[PDB]
Structure 1
Amino acid sequence: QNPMRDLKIEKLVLNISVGESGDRLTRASKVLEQLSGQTPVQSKARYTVRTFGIRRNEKIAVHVTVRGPKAEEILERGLKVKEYQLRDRNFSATGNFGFGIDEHIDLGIKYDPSIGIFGMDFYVVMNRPGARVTRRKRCKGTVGNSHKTTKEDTVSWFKQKYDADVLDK
């Protein structure tokens, strides 16, 4: 309709949730750092479950957010092992969609020992030009209902751009 209402990716979050901290955490951090081109941020456990062998503030996970044509080209690579084929699931009612792949170090980048193998969750967040109104400091507002992102709109754009398919589990 209105060219200022078209969809676009605003961020992609790469996540690794390691069971523990230490050598595995540091290897995952180096993986995420090299892949994103930025230094990643580590995440501490919220509380002690201890059935997963975790304790509070243990730094059990590592993640990074990428935006722009960077995230465009990581997402371009990350869909290849899915052969441009996702599900009717993996799409949220709020418009965001994501998938997780069990070895992306071995999708396009080099493997070597002392780094091991890992799986990354890719989570994409979609929006429209105007999403600043819910992030800016002054006169913070809420997106209008006609401007919201929906699962059907995200699916339609994900099918037409990147010529993909869904629902085929």
Structure 2
Amino acid sequence: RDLKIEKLVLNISVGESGDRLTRASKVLEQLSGQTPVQSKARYTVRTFGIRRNEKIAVHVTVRGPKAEEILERGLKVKEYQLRDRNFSATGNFGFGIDEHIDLGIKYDPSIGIFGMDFYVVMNRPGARVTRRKRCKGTVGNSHKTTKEDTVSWFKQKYDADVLD
């Protein structure tokens, strides 16, 4: 019962649709190598400059061995140092970065500079029992991960100090 990464979600929130949405859409497209799916807004606030169903944000998920090289080259920007809390009670963690030239790219005055959210989810093998269709089940108490199990896993590999 190891502690493999399930997936990696790369979120970018921009309050407007248009060119800036589509130019931010290319950034995840050339990095994840996959077409990023867009996201429409639920309801309207008008202080944020939004309206109902405006296609406000793009994101993309990466699964498998490609996500880890995206994660490590991303986590290097934070210098193998996350903050104190940052961990869900479920067992997951995320972190956001400014300046996506820190993972390196040409400056691209058409495209520009954007800030991304990285987020990681963790599970053990046997998580298919919740995700399948016939005979759906729940994860047992000892197999549900913990907040603590992510801490020892994140301290052991990537050689990092968690912090604080």
The two structures have a TM-score, normalised by structure 2, of 0.97
8 Å Cα contact 2:93-2:121 kept in structure 1? yes
- Structure 2 partner of 1:98: 94
Contact 1:31–1:105 (Cα < 8 Å) also in 2: no
Q: CA deviation at 1:87?
A: 1.6
- Deviation string, structure 1 residues 79-116 (Cα, Å, up to 9, x no partner): 01100110221110000100000122442233211101
Structure 1 residues without counterparts, runs of 5 or longer: none
Q: Distance in 1 between matches of 2:106 and 2:144?
A: 40
- Change in Cα spacing, 1:50 to 1:143, as seen in structure 2 (3 Å) is same
Give the 3-state SS of the residue equivalent to 1:105 in structure 2. Answer: helix
89, 103, 106: which one aligns with 1:107: 103
What's the TM-score once normalised by structure 1's chain length?
A: 0.94
1:150 offset after TM fit, Å?
Answer: 1.2
Aligned counterparts of 2:105 and 2:70: Cα–Cα separation in 1: 11
Q: In the TM superposition, what is the alpha-carbon distance from 1:149 to its structure 2 partner? A: 1.5
CA RMSD for the aligned pairs?
A: 1.0
| Whole-Å separation in 2 of the counterparts to 1:20 and 1:60 | 6
Is the partner of 1:161 in helix, strand or coil? helix
